[PDB]
Design a protein around this ligand. Structure first.
Ligand SMILES: CC(=O)N[C@@H]1[C@@H](O)[C@H](O[C@@H]2O[C@H](CO)[C@@H](O[C@@H]3O[C@H](CO)[C@@H](O)[C@H](O)[C@H]3NC(C)=O)[C@H](O)[C@H]2NC(C)=O)[C@@H](CO)O[C@H]1O
Length: 127
């Protein structure tokens, strides 16, 4: 499913201020990571693949059966992250952001959202 900006903001309300990260941060990250598409996938040079709305990596967070010697920290099949229901992605993201590096785990966030006015991403949305 391809979400709308305000539609996604409402769907990710459980991430608002999670670990000190305001909602605009998550919406900004989703936009630049997947362009709001739950079905987005991208293969990486190391052989791992990124899945879904938040482009969660198979080397650490989920199992896709083709990333040898990887971890499955969120204990889920990577395909579960492609669902129109973003719950699985939201739940796994919470573990990721708690792992020590915060939102820096998302390269697009680090490069395009960090230090910008992320509040603009939820402008006009009735939350
Ligand atoms: C959204 C997404 O999938 N992002 C991926 C990143 O998670 C990944 O970064 C690597 O992540 C692991 C797990 O969080 C990092 O290891 C952790 O490092 C912290 C140090 O602050 C430590 O406290 C944790 O114990 C340790 N986790 C465990 C379970 O061992 C690791 O530092 C990250 N590596 C890099 C190079 O930053 C990157 C790299 O695979 O990919 C993103 O797609």
């Amino acid at each position: 499913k391809v979400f709308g900006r305000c539609e996604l903001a409402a769907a990710m309300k459980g991430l608002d201020n999670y670990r000190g990260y305001s909602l605009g941060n998550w919406v900004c990250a989703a936009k630049f990571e997947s362009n709001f598409n739950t079905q987005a996938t991208n293969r990486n040079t190391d052989g791992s693949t990124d899945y879904g709305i938040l482009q969660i990596n198979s080397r650490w967070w989920c199992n896709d059966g083709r990333t040898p010697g990887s971890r499955n920290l969120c204990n889920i099949p990577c395909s579960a992250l492609l669902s129109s229901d973003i719950t699985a992605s939201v739940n796994c993201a919470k573990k990721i952001v708690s792992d020590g590096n915060g939102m820096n785990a998302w390269v697009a966030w680090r490069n395009r959202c960090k230090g910008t006015d992320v509040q603009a991403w939820i402008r006009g949305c009735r939350l």
